[PDB]
Every structure is written in C-alpha cells, then in structure tokens.
Design a protein around this motif. Structure first.
Motif: not given
Lengths: 109, 232
Positions: B2-6, B169-177, B186-196, B209-211
């Motif tokens: 999976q390629p780095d996301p934007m 508890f309420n939010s996060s300091p980051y917008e994305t993660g 050379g294999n790579t995969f990334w997971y979204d650290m934030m909720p939908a 996702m840990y399936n």
C-alpha cells in the motif's frame, strides 16, 4: 442495592480534580450520570454502553467519565468550578427502564 | 505494498465529534497478553477463544479473537501460541450465564522457537514526524522474533498517548495520524490512527484491521508515525 453512589456528600475546592463513583449490581450494559437542579429536572452529562465506552450527553462540558468495568461508571470534573456545585445522580439501564441511586451533593468552594 | 497516502486518504479528527476517550481507551495501557496458550473453544468459523483471565481488573476470563477467514483460524486452532492485542467489550458477543468476557482481532503468534533465547528483548525504533520534521524517535520492545504489527502498533500509540498526548478524552492535538511499517523485503503498509468522521466511534470495527494477523520481522522492520496538526 442496585445502584451505589460515593461519597454521598463531597466538599471540593475550586480547580481541583473530583471523581464521583457509581456501582451497579445487575451488570446492565448502559450507565448514566446526571445532575439534579431545581427547575432542571435531571440533565444527562455522560452515559456509557459498555466497559470502555463513554458518550457525551446533553451537558458534558467540564466533565470526563470512565467505564473501567461493567459495575463501575464514574464522573470526573477535570478542574472543579462553583458552577459544578449541584447534586448528582447516576442510573444503570436494563432497556426501556432505569435504576437510580441515592444521590451525591457536591460543593465547590 | 500500500503506497503512502495523501490528505484525502486520511481521517481528520476535527471531523470526529464524539468522545476521543473511546479511541484512547484502546491504546492506553490496554492490551490482552498471554504466553503459551491453546484454543479451548470456538464461535464462528473464523474465530478462536482462549482462557485468558483479566490481568488488571476482573473484567474477563475468556478472550475471543477473530481472524480474517476460516482456514486462518484452523491454521492456529490447535497451536501452542502467544496472544497480545487491543480488546473491546461493546458489541463483543459470544454465546458458549455469568459473561466475564472480551473480544479482539488477530493478534496470534506461534509460541515455540519464536522467543529470543536468553533474557534479551528486541528493541524496534519508531520515528515520529510531526508536520514532516522528525521531532522525536523512540523504541518499543518485544520478546518474539516475529511480532504482529498490532503488538508494536499498540505499544507505539501507548507511548505517544503519554509522551505527546496522542489521544485525549475529548479530542487530539493532531488533525491526522498514520503509522507506517517498512520491511527489509521492501514491503510497507500503513494504518489510519484516527477515527472515521461522525459523532460515534465503533471500536469493534476499528480493531478489525488486525484481522490479517499480519506479522513483521522485529529485528529489521522499521516504524514511522506521521502526525499532522492544523490551528497550532
């Protein structure tokens, strides 16, 4: 003793972290934390559907919450304020039915 | 690979109006761990149940783990394994009274051979980029040669909840993660650290996702956490 509130009377200081526990003996999934005020009936501050879960109710500002286990659901005032001085009720819910506790009065000097 | 996301790929926490404490719950000193265990039972085709009794509180004596497909579960059904993952209770079902029960995904590694000989643990480096500038690195540690991505993911976020208030508890300091693994092969995969987006967070689903029970060679795999902020 289907819902137990502790301490039933608390006296805090302005800007102090305050925690008010609630124990339920029926293992219901849902638990609620309200605060009783004259003319206000009973407003919902935070509720929870399970161990782990915790959801904003209608007046969640100034407070956090925590479901460590099926029995315990607690309310937390990050930094107590005179405004937060009220009487607090938690319930546990079975379905369309609630079970309240005896209540907790808090004074924030 | 999976390629780095934007940006239009990643979750914005500002798009989340629910309780971030529900995200936090899953990575703040929160994990089912067990060393050397065998499946005792089963619910659907693709699952495995263990007798792992709650370490900390007294919240569970049996642990159901859901894997990606049946043969994956058979793969491990009668294997002496090692468990470790993030567990949930809302919408965790499994009719085998008295509940005393929790659920999780994947998180299963073979026991024998998979441990580092003596005392010794392997240290995995995590580089954290905040708005691009790599502003901190650290290491998580394990004891399995072959460690689930899950496991180092959980330790990584746990350290960060604490050292950078990744979660609140309420939010996060980051917008994305997001958290990228890059393997020697050379294999790579990334997971979204934030909720939908939305005013609800489904814990059952996020963890799903840990399936894949994805595993990674601890000794050589790398880890990159990329954090973004907005208002500053």
């Amino acid at each position: 003793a289907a819902v137990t509130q502790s301490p039933r009377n608390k006296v805090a200081v302005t800007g102090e972290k305050v925690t008010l526990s609630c124990q339920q003996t029926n293992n219901h999934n849902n638990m609620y934390w309200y605060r009783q005020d004259t003319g206000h009936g009973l407003r919902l501050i935070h509720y929870s559907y399970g161990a782990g879960s915790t959801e904003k109710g209608d007046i969640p500002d100034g407070y956090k919450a925590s479901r460590p286990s099926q029995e315990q659901f607690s309310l937390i005032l990050e930094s107590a304020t005179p405004s937060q001085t009220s009487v607090y009720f938690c319930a546990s819910g079975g379905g369309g039915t609630l079970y309240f506790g005896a209540g907790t009065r808090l004074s924030v000097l | 690979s999976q390629p780095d996301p934007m940006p239009d790929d990643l979750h914005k926490s500002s798009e989340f109006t629910g309780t971030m404490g529900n995200m936090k719950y899953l990575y703040d000193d929160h994990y089912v761990s067990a060393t050397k265990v065998k499946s005792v039972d089963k619910f659907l085709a693709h699952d495995l149940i263990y007798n792992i009794s709650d370490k900390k509180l007294k919240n569970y004596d049996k642990v159901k783990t859901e894997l990606l497909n049946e043969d994956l579960a058979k793969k491990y059904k009668d294997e002496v394994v090692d468990v470790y993952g993030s567990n949930y209770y809302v919408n965790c079902y499994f009719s085998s009274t008295w509940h005393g029960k929790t659920c999780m995904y994947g998180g299963i590694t073979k026991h024998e051979g998979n441990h580092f000989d003596n005392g010794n643990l392997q240290n995995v480096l995590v580089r954290v980029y905040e708005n691009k500038r790599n502003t901190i690195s650290f290491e998580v540690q394990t004891d399995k040669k072959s460690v689930t991505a899950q496991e180092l993911d959980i330790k990584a976020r746990n350290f960060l909840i604490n050292k950078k208030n990744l979660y609140e508890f309420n939010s996060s300091p980051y917008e994305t993660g997001y958290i990228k693994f890059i393997e020697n092969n050379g294999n790579t995969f990334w997971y979204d650290m934030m909720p939908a987006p939305g005013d609800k967070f489904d814990q059952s689903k996020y963890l799903m996702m840990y399936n894949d029970n994805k595993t990674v060679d601890s000794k050589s795999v790398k880890i990159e956490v990329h954090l973004t902020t907005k208002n500053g």
